[PDB]
Amino acid sequence: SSPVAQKYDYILVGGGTAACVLANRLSADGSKRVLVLEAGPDNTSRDVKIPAAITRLFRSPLDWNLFSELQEQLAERQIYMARGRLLGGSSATNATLYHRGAAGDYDAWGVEGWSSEDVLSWFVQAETNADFGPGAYHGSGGPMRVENPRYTNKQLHTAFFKAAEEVGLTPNSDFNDWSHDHAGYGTFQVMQDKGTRADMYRQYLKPVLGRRNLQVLTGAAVTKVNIDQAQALGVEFSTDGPTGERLSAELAPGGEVIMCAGAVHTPFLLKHSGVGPSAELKEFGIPVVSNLAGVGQNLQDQPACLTAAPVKEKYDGIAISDHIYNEKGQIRKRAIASYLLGGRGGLTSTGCDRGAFVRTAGQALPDLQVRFVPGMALDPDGVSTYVRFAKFQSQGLKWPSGITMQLIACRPQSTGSVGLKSADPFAPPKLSPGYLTDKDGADLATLRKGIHWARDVARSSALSEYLDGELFPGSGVVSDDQIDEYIRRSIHSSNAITGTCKMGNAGDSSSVVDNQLRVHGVEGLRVVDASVVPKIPGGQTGAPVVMIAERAAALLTGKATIG
Ligand SMILES: Cc1cc2nc3c(=O)[nH]c(=O)nc-3n(C[C@H](O)[C@H](O)[C@H](O)COP(=O)(O)OP(=O)(O)OC[C@H]3O[C@@H](n4cnc5c(N)ncnc54)[C@H](O)[C@@H]3O)c2cc1C
């Protein structure tokens, strides 16, 4: 009752990160009626705008509340895998960290037309950096806002840098500069506009919500893509939910359907739509339009574990938790006041924006990403501690002061999968992260060796002055087996998730899309989001998504060509 006898030049499934970019650039003439269907609501939550309230988006209405299948290798647990559920997608719920990884990450893709020399200009074109001048690696005129974090914990952040220096790391002054090596300790830039989250809704969709050729439907959950037998022809959605009406939205002659539901829900929606490994599709009774074996497969996420330690009594009150809560658990008015009048203070932080990239075994690129938090975890799952921190508000308790080190396998070797669990298009997908299953034990050894590195750092003079004990894993965890066990029980997602509809050269029987993001054997169906990432780059994945979406956009409208 919303696309009523209206034929669209481009239909966008999902109003996420890449989708926001695409609507902007495709709606930019006047000739292309673009539609955007977003399951979740509009972007208006204050908890999304204030970076520190990331703590309140986890397991919230605005998250998809996805949970993995049982992971036998991880002590038979389910793994919460947070995903944003609103316009802008996970850019509105993410940690705001700005990482491109290294140039080799892209060269390793092997795909023609998408080497590091091909991607670098599309990063720079999307960026306005408050803290680096315009150059080969940084932009000044692009829609994204990037800045150095406007919080500093004067005492713990400096001691982390002194500690890292003590154990032999050297600094890196820009982890996104491909003229020097990726490893090093340093400060991560953040996707923030003076301490407000600068999500892709705010930076791209909001400035164009008035173009008459641009129609944005929130609350609109797509259930399949119409493919008349091969050619996509529309989508089906429901404006209320599982128990509503099954509307349809037709395309114009020449109109394409761009998948933008993310590396979780896109390979899910495609499988419901007829594109996937047939042996899986037959089992639920879905005809096969295209039998591509790579849909669902190659899921790549970056696992994390953590260490935490309290600070000595004499340093009580110098943690970021002390800057956000008072001894009774109410938000400090000084922290509110510095945020609102100046865009400074604890509220601007997601807490994890200083750290390191480390080679644990002389790998070619860093296998380990460290995120240092000047606050103390109280649960060894880091995602839970943030949930816990939110609910800790006004309980009358005092969150103890300490530090945390989150360790991340940033170029992991284990692959996962996204599959069908029900015929119900409103059912949760079958999701298996598959961390720690690479045949060589290499991801587990990255993290185990990360733990030893984090204790060396904590044991340095620089940090031992402040620290007093270790709470996680703790004194009882000495042996490697004991470390490996703790990893298996506390391992959590650093929240990347790429590769489920990966692109590849012609003749790649494993690839789902081609170097122009068109899925094989279907007409007018493209995929532009984190699924197409053939090999996950070293770091958080928001930025490479934006790049991919800019590139795909300028390709569609004939401003650039690939290969
Ligand atoms: C908690 C968290 C922290 C992160 N931190 C960082 C970080 O600090 N820096 C960084 O660079 N990256 C970070 N990431 C990753 C980054 O946010 C994502 O990889 C990136 O935003 C993915 O973009 P996308 O367009 O592929 O997906 P999304 O932005 O998730 O877009 C997919 C969209 O599809 C919608 N959708 C799903 N199913 C349907 C359906 N049936 N019908 C309609 N719409 C549907 C979803 O609601 C969503 O809006 C983080 C991720 C999370 C979850």
Residue numbers in the entry: 77 to 305, 310 to 643
Lines quoted from the article behind this entry:
Fatty-acid photodecarboxylase (FAP), together with protochlorophyllide oxidoreductase and DNA photolyases, is a member of the rare class of photoenzymes that require light to initiate each catalytic event. Absorption of a blue-light photon by the flavin adenine dinucleotide (FAD) cofactor within FAP triggers the decarboxylation of the fatty-acid substrate, which leads to the formation of a hydrocarbon molecule and CO2.
Here, we extend the study of Sorigué et al. by carrying out the refinement of intermediate-state structures against extrapolated structure factors at 20 ps, 900 ps, 300 ns and 2 µs. We present additional TR-SFX data collected at a pump–probe delay of 900 ps at three different pump-laser power densities that explain why the particular pump-laser power density was chosen for the TR-SFX experiment reported by Sorigué et al.. In order to model the structural changes that had occurred at the different time points, structure-factor extrapolation was carried out using Xtrapol8, which estimates the structure-factor amplitudes F ext that would have been measured for each pump–probe data set if the photo-triggered intermediate were present in the crystals at 100% occupancy (equation 1). The occupancy of intermediate states was determined to be between 25% and 35% for the four time delays. Three possible explanations can be offered: (i) the spatial overlap between the pump and probe laser changed slightly, (ii) the apparent difference reflects the noise level of the data or (iii) at 900 ps a positive peak due to photodecarboxylated CO2 compensates part of the negative peak on the carboxyl group.
